[PDB]
């Protein structure tokens, strides 16, 4: 049925520094339009499973 408890981050502003860690969960903003914490086109949740 699928083990959906193992997630990974697929969007970030900039690549990590070595051994750096980032557990935030802010709505990513692809396009120029601001997101205001809601999903939509060019406003994506940053974690997939």
């Amino acid at each position, epitope marked *: *049925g*699928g083990n959906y408890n193992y997630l990974y981050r*697929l*969007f970030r502003k900039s690549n990590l520094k070595p051994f750096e860690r980032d557990i935030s969960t802010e709505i990513y903003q*692809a*396009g120029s339009t601001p997101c205001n914490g809601v*999903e*939509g*086109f*060019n406003c*994506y949740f940053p974690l*997939q*499973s």
Partner: antibody
Amino acid sequence: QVQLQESGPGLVKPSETLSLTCTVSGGSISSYYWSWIRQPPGKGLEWIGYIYYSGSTNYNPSLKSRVTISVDTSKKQFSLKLSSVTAADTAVYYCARLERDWPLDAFDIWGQGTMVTVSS
Amino acid sequence: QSALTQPASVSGSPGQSITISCTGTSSDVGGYNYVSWYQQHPGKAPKFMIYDVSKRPSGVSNRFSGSKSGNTASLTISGLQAEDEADYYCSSYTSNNTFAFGGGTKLTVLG
């Protein structure tokens, strides 16, 4: 940069074995996956197996027991041979790459296909 | 060795937005999120659009967006421009270690 290109004939009657190749232009063998994708006229797509490069495989059990894919890494070829065709396999045939490493998946640069009719 | 699901042609006026659906079982699209979309112009070769429910590869407009709810993904176009009249396919990574393609949907920009 990298492009694909089909080959091979098609007009043979019904109940034989056809062949096709997808010689690679820009040069990227030995790193990706490469698969063959059918499409009948006016209908949706389909899928057939792929072949890593070092190892290999085949797929789409519906077409299993008929299809064999092979790879020549030197001159960068995929052979695809289906056997005992049935004139229901009269379709265009693309040879799209695949993608791994950077997950992506789905597919990628395709190859303009090849109308392959099956009849007398 | 079966198939997915998609509606036939849709309609729409320019400048608006539109959303096309792609519904599958919860063993291919529900249980995965490796879905990708493809746009094919009549008599051409399909073109790669976005991998992972959403992620326009560098080279595609930003009028496209992908999303999922559950074993059902969807693609939204914004400001319908009258050159997007094409066919749109979705694909995924069904179990049994295989891929699958949709059924296609003819976009009509309501000329």
